Amino acid sequence: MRTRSTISTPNGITWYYEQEGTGPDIVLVPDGLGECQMFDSSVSQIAAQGFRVTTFDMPGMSRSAKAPAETYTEVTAQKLASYVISILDALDIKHATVWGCSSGASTVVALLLGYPDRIRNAMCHELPTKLLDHLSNTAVLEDEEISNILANVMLNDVSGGSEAWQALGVEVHARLHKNYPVWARGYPRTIPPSAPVQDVEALRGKPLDWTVGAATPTESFFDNIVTATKAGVNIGLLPGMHFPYVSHPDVFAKYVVETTQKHLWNSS
Amino acid sequence: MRTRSTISTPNGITWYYEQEGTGPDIVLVPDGLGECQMFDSSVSQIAAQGFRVTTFDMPGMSRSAKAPAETYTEVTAQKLASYVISILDALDIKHATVWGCSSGASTVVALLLGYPDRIRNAMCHELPTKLLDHLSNTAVLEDEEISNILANVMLNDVSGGSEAWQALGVEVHARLHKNYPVWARGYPRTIPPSAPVQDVEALRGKPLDWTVGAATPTESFFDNIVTATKAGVNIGLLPGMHFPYVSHPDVFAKYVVETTQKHLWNSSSV
C-alpha cells in the first residue's frame, strides 16, 4: 500500500522517498538528521483521512546520501527549501501542506515565504535561531567520537522519551550513526543564522502554525514563542520534546490532520 | 551590619523582617513558602551597590507565623499586596522596587497596578495563572504526608539544583516542613485565579520586568511569555528554575541590581 522508491533531480540528488494515500498533499520534512523512518507510524494514520502523505530522507543522509557535497555542507534554510521544491517538482506536487522540525522547521518557513503559491500552510516545530557553541565544537572531532556523543544526546537529552527512541530499531540507529558526523559538520553552525524569522512583519497573516515541545527546557525555544506572538502566528505546545512524531506519534498525527483540515476549510 | 527583627502591623501580623544597606529601596518578596532566608546570600551583594534591601517572612509562614487565619487561608494576590503595603508603611518605605516569585510574582504585579505611586518597578518571576490539580489535592491530606510529598517536589521538580537547595540547612528545612501544609491549604487553589495579568492592556507601558526559569519545562510558564509579549513587557530568562535566588544567587543579585539601575535612570523629569 505504501510506495517506497527513489527519484533523481537536476541538482544532483538521488532522493529516497515514501508516499501513501490520495487527496490533498501533506509533506513531512524531517529534521537535520534526515530520517523519514521516524514518520513511519503516523504516515499511514494521516493518509487514511483522505490525504496523500509524502516524506523522504534529506540530502546526504541515510538513504538520500547520493548527492553533491554542496547539499550537506554549509547548509541553510534557503538551500534546503530549494531542494524540497525540486523533489516536489519531480513528484508533481503543485500545492502542499508542509511539516518541519529542527532544520526542517527553518525549511518550511523558508518554503512558505519563498514559494507562497506552492505552500497551502506550514507547520514548524522548534525552529533553531541561536548558535549553540557546544554543538559547533563537535564538528572538528573524529567521526566515531561525534556519533557516540550525539547518539547519547538524542537519547537522554532531547528525544522526549528514550523508550520510543530506542524502539526505532538497530537499522535506523545504524543509519543515524553515519548521519551524526555529516550533520555536525554541515548544520549547527550555518542553520541558526539562516532562520527566516528575523523579519517579523513577513510572517504576519501567513498560514503558519508554530509548536514547541512541552517537556523541552524554556531557554531552548523561548525565542520562538516571542517571535510567534509578535507576528500573531498560532503558537502551541506538543507533548514531548524535539521529536513529537517519535515520542507521541498519535498526538502528532492528529495535530497534522486537524491543522490541515482547518486550512482546507479556510480556502473559500 | 544587617538588621534582623520583628514588627507588628494594624492587620494583626507580627512580621519577621531583615534589612541592610542605604539608598533606594529594594524589597524581596518571597514565594508561597514564605522564607526570606533563601535571599540571605544576595541581600548583602545587592545592598553593597548603594541600595537598602528589605525582606521578610510572609504571614503564617516561618517566623511571621503569628497572624490571623485570614492572612494564610484563601490567599490571593490582592490580599498579599495589602499585607506588603502594611509592612512598607510600618518601616516607612514610601517608594520601592519589588521582586516577587510564585505567589510573590502575582503580589508584585498587584502592587504595581494597585499602588503605582509606591512601586518604582516590579520584577515578577514565574507567575502562576493555571490551576494545577496535583497541588490542590494535597490540601485534604494529613500534615506529615503533605510535608513529605512537597519537600520532595521542591527538591527534584522545582528547585533548579538540589545541591544548593539542600545546602540551605536543617533550620530552614525545619521551618519549610511546617509551612508546606499551611501553604497547601491556603495558596494553590485560590492564587492562580487571582492573577492580575487577565487584563493585558493594564500592563502596557508599566515598569515591569518579567522572567522565567531557563531549565523549567516550557509548558509550566508558557502563558507568561505569551502574556508578556502581548503587553510589550520585558520578558527574559534567569538560570535554573523556580528559585533563582537559591540556585544561582550571583546571577540573581546581578539581575536585581541591573534592572533597578535601569529604572532609576528612566526617572528623568522635566
TrEMBL record, chain B:
Residues 27-207 form the AB hydrolase-1 domain. It holds the Pfam family Abhydrolase_1. InterPro entries: AB_hydrolase, AB_hydrolase_1, AB_hydrolase_fold. SUPFAM superfamilies: alpha/beta-Hydrolases. It comes from the Eukaryota. This is Zearalenone lactonase. It comes from Bionectria ochroleuca.
